[PDB]
Amino acid sequence: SSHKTFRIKRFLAKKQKQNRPIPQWIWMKTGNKIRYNSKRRHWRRTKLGL
Amino acid sequence: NKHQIKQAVKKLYDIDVAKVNTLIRPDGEKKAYVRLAPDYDALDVANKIGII
Amino acid sequence: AKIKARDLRGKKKEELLKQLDDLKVELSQLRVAKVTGGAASKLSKIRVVRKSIARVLTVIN
Amino acid sequence: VAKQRIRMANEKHSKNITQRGNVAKTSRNAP
Amino acid sequence: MDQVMQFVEPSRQFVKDSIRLVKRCTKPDRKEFQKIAMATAIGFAIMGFIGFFVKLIHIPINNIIV
Amino acid sequence: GLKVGPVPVLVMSLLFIASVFMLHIWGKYTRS
Amino acid sequence: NEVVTREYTINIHKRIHGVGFKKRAPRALKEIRKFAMKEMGTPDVRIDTRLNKAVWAKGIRNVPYRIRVRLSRKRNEDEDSPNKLYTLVTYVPVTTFKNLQTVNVDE
Amino acid sequence: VRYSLDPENPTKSCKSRGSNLRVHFKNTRETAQAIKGMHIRKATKYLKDVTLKKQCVPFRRYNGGVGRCAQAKQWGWTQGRWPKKSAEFLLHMLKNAESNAELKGLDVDSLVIEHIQVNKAPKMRRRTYRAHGRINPYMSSPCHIEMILTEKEQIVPKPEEEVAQKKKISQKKLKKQKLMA
Amino acid sequence: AIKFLEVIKPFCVILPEIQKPERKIQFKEKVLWTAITLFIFLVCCQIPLFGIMSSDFYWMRVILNRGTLMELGISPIVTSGLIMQLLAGAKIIEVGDTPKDRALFNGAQKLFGMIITIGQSIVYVMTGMYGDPSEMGAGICLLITIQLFVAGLIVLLLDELLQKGYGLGSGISLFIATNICETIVWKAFSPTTVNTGRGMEFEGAIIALFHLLATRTDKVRALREAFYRQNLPNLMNLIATIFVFAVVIYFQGFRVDLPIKSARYRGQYNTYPIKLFYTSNIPIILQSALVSNLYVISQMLSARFSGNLLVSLLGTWSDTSSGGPARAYPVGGLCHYLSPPESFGSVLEDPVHAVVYIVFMLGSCAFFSKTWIEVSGSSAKDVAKQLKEQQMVMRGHRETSMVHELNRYIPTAAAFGGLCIGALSVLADFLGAIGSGTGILLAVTIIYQYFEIFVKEQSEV
Ligand SMILES: [Mg+2]
Ligand SMILES: [Mg+2]
Ligand SMILES: [Mg+2]
Ligand SMILES: [Mg+2]
């Protein structure tokens, strides 16, 4: 809601920054296996619970 | 806080401050809207700071 | 002109603090250059000046 | 600004039916 | 004073504009200046003398031609 | 529009210098 | 004589007879367009916005029974289109429909 | 890239294929069987009639529920349909094969669809929402298509009104070309 | 557009072109072609032209490099390109935006120099600058026009060769600099002999020093004459040239770096540099051509209304004929104020006259730069469109505010670049440096370009 606590607004912000695609140079690392960020989230498909 | 920010901006850049407004951004960073005294030209001061 | 901890061992507290302040000023000027189009040379200098500051603070402590 | 301009431009635009494919992007050629 | 502010103000702005630009330029450093010194010097020797050589060799031919 | 290889240019360009060489040489010696 | 203009009366009443209320005026626009191909043999029929306005002047179901229209076959100016000609259909207000023949119009 | 059949005389053939095409496999299998063996000009004209509903594709194997039409009597069949997406996908593939013939210097006006084959591609997974809180599959059924075109002795030129059309320029193609150039 | 793009059509289909390299050519292969390419051009710079005897005069052609296969020089090609972009930039000429129309556009810009090649040649033949066509006739004119055609024709392909990855950079820039560098070294090591009433002596400043230092009993007099010849190169003119070289090198690197990134991909940070010499050497070049003809124009004008105080006050003119050839100098008026000093003392004699010229020369180039940008298509809006075309953008900005951020510097970098261009050019002209302030900048710039490529290749070469 608009009425927010500092702790909640801060927890939300960390969830905002984690929600981004991987750097593309990560693909060129020597032993790399990751193809995409498999921990992506959508505000509608899956909910944070808090 | 606004007091510390005012004291920081003055000391770092030897300028004067009229008021400091602050909001915490959705990504968790705090943004300060520092209005300088009327005799300080913010566009001039920005050149000193290298902003522009 | 690198800050090696061996060159700071004897210096006095006021001297080292002055040296620290130059590095703190040098960094804040770089952090400006990060967002205003600083050369790749200036971006790489940040780590060099972050650790220089930590070297000075270690020797002071 | 005169309100009859709304009618004038609407009717002028309705004349594009005959010139499909070569409609002038700007009629105010000056500038 | 239109006659004064008309063309004085652009010139005073012009002077303060150059400084605002100059204090913004990435002026080459003394170390970089030195780099450009040798590089240009070696280059100028490369172009200056090799182009010089073509002209001298053409001399004995040119004197014979005329 | 002919598309040209560098050698053609070198071969054409090389022989052009050869041509003027004879013209300068021939013009004098045979009129000497 | 590709470029030609004639004035027709279309008996919309018999074209839309038996059609549902919410499709009566949409279908008249279709029967007018279909009429245009038959008369001028041009796939590219363009119905004027006044003729569309006239056909809808009375709502979706009480469409006018007869409408006088002008068909003008014209050269398709764009060479990108496959069609060399198109037909323009304009509205011809008439105080009466009695005795109106199909007329040749010469510009 | 291996085709199911080897051409009889490879120098006189042109190939074309596509994979994971999102066109119904059952509709496209029937559409291919209609044009198999056709001359390239005849095949091209036929799939342009399927687009306009002037010639039907007989549905012979995958015919469950398919309706009857008068044009199916042309093929000695009662069931026919007018798959527009399959017709258009196969036209694009014919255009590509036609271009490959040109690149090899073949007589494009003598080409015949010697071999054509539709295969199922891996299905794409969507879902639909059923009563009583259930969820069920909503599978797209794409296909792989491969054709081989061969020169034969019957020649058929391109229609006159067809070669008279402008070479449509693509603005969006240009925009990407600027970025790379 | 319609009657220009299609008029090119028939001829560009027959003119030749250089082939695309299949793959990225090796640097040590690039160097080979470049050195070969440069050597050939240099050879053209010396071969005398065939059949030119009447006038340019023959003795100078022995000394000279005037009269060589490069007699018309790379000038047609440079003027060809500038005139195009000048009209194209102004929207006067419409350039087909497609690569194929661009590939033809290249041929069109190539076509101009080939046109300019014949046009410039015709001027020099008829006027007697090689000699009367009656003396030469069609045949000699035929060869001279052909040769002047082939050299520029060769010069064109050789540049296009380097432009297309078979070498380094571009030929034209390489060529103009090599001339500049050669002139400097030649004028220091030239073994030419000058026949004086003081005797025979060498020309090259370095050569002349040791030749004189032994040939003169008065070794202080050698210290004076050797460094202060008033009709021959001096070690000072070498020192003057060297001193300018460093300063230009310093101000060569001036640039305002704006941050930009791709609007389509994260990170990928890059920068667009607004170079202080934003207008290149064009401003002063246009200014000089204006001044020179203003001297010629006034000469002819002032001979017809000299009795009118206004035409005199505009600019007076005389005929200096004492001893040497009749040379046309101004006597007073504006043109007199629009002239540079010829001697250091002359500046001292009239303090006002010097400041009047300088303000003209600083204002003219600065004003030329400011006005040049808008026409040339390098103003912020045009720059922003190029960035928009490339899908670049300033982070945190909308596409429109880019223009606001670019106008912070570009309009000013225009004027101050021109004012800086002139000021350093005054020093080049005043202190007797070789090649004018335009030339040194050209030389330093080009050598800088090859250097920075050269170092990149050295990373793995
Ligand atoms: Mg929900
Ligand atoms: Mg059943
Ligand atoms: Mg049913
Ligand atoms: Mg439910």
mmCIF file of C-alpha atoms in Angstrom, chain A:
data_model
loop_
_atom_site.group_PDB
_atom_site.id
_atom_site.type_symbol
_atom_site.label_atom_id
_atom_site.label_comp_id
_atom_site.label_asym_id
_atom_site.label_seq_id
_atom_site.Cartn_x
_atom_site.Cartn_y
_atom_site.Cartn_z
ATOM 1 C CA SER A 1 0.000 0.000 0.000
ATOM 2 C CA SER A 2 1.038 3.642 0.103
ATOM 3 C CA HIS A 3 1.255 3.424 3.879
ATOM 4 C CA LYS A 4 4.516 1.508 4.170
ATOM 5 C CA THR A 5 7.028 0.735 6.873
ATOM 6 C CA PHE A 6 10.727 1.364 6.447
ATOM 7 C CA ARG A 7 11.489 -2.327 6.918
ATOM 8 C CA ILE A 8 8.914 -3.356 4.320
ATOM 9 C CA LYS A 9 9.951 -0.679 1.838
ATOM 10 C CA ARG A 10 13.557 -1.807 2.233
ATOM 11 C CA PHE A 11 12.755 -5.495 1.793
ATOM 12 C CA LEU A 12 10.792 -4.624 -1.338
ATOM 13 C CA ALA A 13 13.737 -2.684 -2.765
ATOM 14 C CA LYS A 14 16.088 -5.650 -2.453
ATOM 15 C CA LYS A 15 13.518 -7.735 -4.317
ATOM 16 C CA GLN A 16 13.448 -5.030 -6.991
ATOM 17 C CA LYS A 17 17.193 -5.151 -7.645
ATOM 18 C CA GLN A 18 17.443 -8.951 -7.713
ATOM 19 C CA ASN A 19 14.802 -8.933 -10.470
ATOM 20 C CA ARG A 20 17.000 -8.279 -13.487
ATOM 21 C CA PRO A 21 18.571 -10.330 -16.295
ATOM 22 C CA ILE A 22 22.134 -11.584 -16.036
ATOM 23 C CA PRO A 23 25.080 -9.704 -17.555
ATOM 24 C CA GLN A 24 25.806 -11.072 -21.010
ATOM 25 C CA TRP A 25 29.551 -11.309 -20.414
ATOM 26 C CA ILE A 26 28.849 -13.888 -17.699
ATOM 27 C CA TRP A 27 28.235 -16.242 -20.625
ATOM 28 C CA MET A 28 31.847 -15.969 -21.764
ATOM 29 C CA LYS A 29 33.415 -17.036 -18.468
ATOM 30 C CA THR A 30 35.563 -20.127 -18.656
ATOM 31 C CA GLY A 31 33.527 -22.687 -16.729
ATOM 32 C CA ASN A 32 30.196 -20.910 -16.895
ATOM 33 C CA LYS A 33 26.961 -22.895 -17.034
ATOM 34 C CA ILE A 34 24.272 -20.258 -16.418
ATOM 35 C CA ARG A 35 22.068 -19.411 -19.398
ATOM 36 C CA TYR A 36 19.584 -17.025 -17.771
ATOM 37 C CA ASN A 37 18.458 -15.725 -14.408
ATOM 38 C CA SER A 38 16.278 -18.615 -13.259
ATOM 39 C CA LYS A 39 15.130 -16.651 -10.183
ATOM 40 C CA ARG A 40 13.116 -14.016 -12.049
ATOM 41 C CA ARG A 41 9.820 -12.887 -10.553
ATOM 42 C CA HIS A 42 6.665 -11.291 -11.896
ATOM 43 C CA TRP A 43 4.400 -9.201 -9.700
ATOM 44 C CA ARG A 44 1.368 -11.082 -11.054
ATOM 45 C CA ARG A 45 2.465 -14.683 -11.654
ATOM 46 C CA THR A 46 4.011 -15.227 -8.207
ATOM 47 C CA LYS A 47 3.623 -13.246 -4.993
ATOM 48 C CA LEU A 48 6.143 -12.345 -2.301
ATOM 49 C CA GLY A 49 3.918 -13.143 0.680
ATOM 50 C CA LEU A 50 4.922 -9.974 2.525
#
